[PDB]
Amino acid sequence: VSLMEKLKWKIKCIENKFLNYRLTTNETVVAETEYGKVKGVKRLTVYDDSYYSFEGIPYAQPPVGELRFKAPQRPTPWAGVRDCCNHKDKSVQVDFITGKVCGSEDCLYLSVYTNNLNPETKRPVLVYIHGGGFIIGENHRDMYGPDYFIKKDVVLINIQYRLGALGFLSLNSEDLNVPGNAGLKDQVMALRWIKNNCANFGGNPDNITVFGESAGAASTHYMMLTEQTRGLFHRGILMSGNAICPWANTQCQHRAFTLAKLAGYKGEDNDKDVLEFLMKAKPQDLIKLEEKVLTLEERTNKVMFPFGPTVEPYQTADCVLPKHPREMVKTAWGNSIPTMMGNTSYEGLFFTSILKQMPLLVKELETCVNFVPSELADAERTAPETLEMGAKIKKAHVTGETPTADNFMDLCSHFYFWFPMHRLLQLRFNHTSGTPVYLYRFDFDSEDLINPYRIMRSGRGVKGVSHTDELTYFFWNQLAKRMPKESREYKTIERMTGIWTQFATTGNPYSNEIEGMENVSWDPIEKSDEVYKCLNISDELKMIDVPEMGKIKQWESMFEKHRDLF
Numbered sequence: 341v342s343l344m345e346k347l348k349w350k351i352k353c354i355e356n357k358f359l360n361y362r363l364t365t366n367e368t369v370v371a372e373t374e375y376g377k378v379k380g381v382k383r384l385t386v387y388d389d390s391y392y393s394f395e396g397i398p399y400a401q402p403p404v405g406e407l408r409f410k411a412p413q414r415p416t417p418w419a420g421v422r423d424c425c426n427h428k429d430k431s432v433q434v435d436f437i438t439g440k441v442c443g444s445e446d447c448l449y450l451s452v453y454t455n456n457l458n459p460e461t462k463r464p465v466l467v468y469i470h471g472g473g474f475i476i477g478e479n480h481r482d483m484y485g486p487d488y489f490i491k492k493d494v495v496l497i498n499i500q501y502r503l504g505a506l507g508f509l510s511l512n513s514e515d516l517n518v519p520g521n522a523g524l525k526d527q528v529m530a531l532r533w534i535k536n537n538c539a540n541f542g543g544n545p546d547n548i549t550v551f552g553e554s555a556g557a558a559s560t561h562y563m564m565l566t567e568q569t570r571g572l573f574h575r576g577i578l579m580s581g582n583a584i585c586p587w588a589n590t591q592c593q594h595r596a597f598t599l600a601k602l603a604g605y606k607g608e609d610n611d612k613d614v615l616e617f618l619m620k621a622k623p624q625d626l627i628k629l630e631e632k633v634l635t636l637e638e639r640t641n642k643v644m645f646p647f648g649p650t651v652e653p654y655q656t657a658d659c660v661l662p663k664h665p666r667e668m669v670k671t672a673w674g675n676s677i678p679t680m681m682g683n684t685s686y687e688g689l690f691f692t693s694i695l696k697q698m699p700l701l702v703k704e705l706e707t708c709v710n711f712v713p714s715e716l717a718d719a720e721r722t723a724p725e726t727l728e729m730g731a732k733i734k735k736a737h738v739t740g741e742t743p744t745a746d747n748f749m750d751l752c753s754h755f756y757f758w759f760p761m762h763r764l765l766q767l768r769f770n771h772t773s774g775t776p777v778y779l780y781r782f783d784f785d786s787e788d789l790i791n792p793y794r795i796m797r798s799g800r801g802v803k804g805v806s807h808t809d810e811l812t813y814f815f816w817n818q819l820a821k822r823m824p825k826e827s828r829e830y831k832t833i834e835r836m837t838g839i840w841t842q843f844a845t846t847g848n849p850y851s852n853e854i855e856g857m858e859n860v861s862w863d864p865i866e867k868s869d870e871v872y873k874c875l876n877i878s879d880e881l882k883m884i885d886v887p888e889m890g891k892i893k894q895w896e897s898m899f900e901k902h903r904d905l906f
């Protein structure tokens with residue numbers, strides 16, 4: 341927290357509103373939805389393109405009052421024309437830059453964008469679910485502008501969903517109807533809306549692609565796992581994340597009481613009494629205290645967030661996760677739709693900011709016991725077997741006699757992203773109709789065009805392709821600028837929106853109409869593959885064996901004596 345990030349961030353924000361106004365037009369339009377008419381408006385881009393914009397389309401009732409912590413309910417429709425010419429608020433969260441809580445409980449909205457409201461053909465529909473660890477994020481165009489994607493003839497939809505304790509509180513007591521995963525059930529309801537309404541915006545309801553980055557990738561994967569969404573969409577893209585990443589789920593049923601007690605609850609550890617208190621609390625109080633819920637023991641054992649997706653303790657009407665995700669892969673409908681997955685070439689660089697805060701973290705690599713997968717480790721991480729397992733990790737990532745910060749961040753690349761990807765691929769290969777999985781590796785490094793996460797990760801001046809660096813080439817954000825058509829950055833925008841649009845359309849990401857792809861033979865992964873091939877996306881596009889594969893096998897070797905748990 342170095343105070344006046346908040347300044348230029350406030351004055352990049354005084355600019356973003358003038359610019360937003362200047363890029364607005366007077367061309368309003370009305371579209372039909374199953375809940376009533378919505379009025380949208382055309383907007384301009386800095387590349388002199390334009391698109392129709394519908395923001396603040398409700399897909400559920402505002403989950404306020406008695407609806408807090410509950411599964412979403414269908415919204416209440418209207419006669420007349422609803423105003424969708426302005427965005428709604430984001431879900432209640434801590435602003436990662438201003439450090440202050442922002443947003444509203446009234447956040448269950450989606451936005452629809454297209455360059456042509458009346459196309460002559462049904463268009464592929466792309467649905468983006470944002471990341472942010474299930475605790476931050478939004479569909480506001482200052483972070484996720486559609487301006488690049490609307491160069492292509494697609495319909496792009498950006499959803500919101502409840503975050504933090506408001507989205508992911510879970511209580512054991514069956515009588516209370518807070519089984520957990522409200523935020524994922526939000527996504528399910530948004531997907532149902534999209535399926536039933538995208539046609540009114542020129543979309544093909546039989547050709548929908550869901551994609552997401554980070555927590556949005558885990559979300560996309562959860563939407564492919566749950567039987568609640570069966571057949572609602574037809575392709576998935578998992579960008580740096582999936583549902584069996586260790587940060588992507590947690591059993592948090594005991595932490596509601598902790599949150600209550602942090603906020604001033606007086607009384608006993610009792611689900612009913614705890615729920616009653618949490619129902620009454622100011623939303624901004626609960627979200628601000630969320631950062632204090634995890635114990636030192638939990639943090640040591642690499643629990644990243646106190647509330648997130650959870651295995652629900654009993655089954656309700658709108659249950660999304662009845663079993664551990666690894667179990668849900670066994671029968672997942674989404675196993676049998678075309679899928680693309682990928683990661684960046686230095687994911688772990690993202691934890692730069694965390695390291696600067698707590699330098700002593702680097703000494704975790706002395707034994708690496710803390711990064712042994714939790715299901716394998718003992719609670720004190722002092723067991724000799726845990727020490728042995730840790731030594732396998734240590735050999736994969738410690739390059740000198742003493743671990744460095746770079747070693748730590750390389751390790752994080754695998755703990756948080758590459759190893760979970762491996763486990764998923766192998767698990768799914770036992771339960772798939774045979775539909776292809778394509779892998780990419782995003783390896784394009786530039787500091788000439790950036791996005792706000794680079795601030796948060798303090799990555800200005802740091803080199804390598806961190807977690808979230810690829811977002812810059814998919815979405816407009818308030819820190820972006822018009823780049824020369826010949827720049828490597830602009831060409832990367834064209835390649836990324838191009839490949840994603842090609843995959844959305846056909847279920848195959850290859851096209852010789854994409855510059856650089858003229859010699860790419862991009863083949864999906866097979867069960868019989870001992871080495872993964874990926875499209876490596878840099879200044880050149882090249883098919884390579886995943887450079888991370890060696891370290892991936894090294895992680896896998898921790899499961900030599902526990903193969904059932906892999």
Ligand SMILES: *B(O)c1ccc(OCc2ccccc2F)c(Cl)c1
Nearest residue numbers: 471472473474554555556587691756
């Ligand atoms: B993806 O949604 C994602 C977000 C955050 C992660 O780590 C926690 C974190 C939070 C804030 C700053 C830096 C961080 F690393 C992860 Cl692993 C994934």
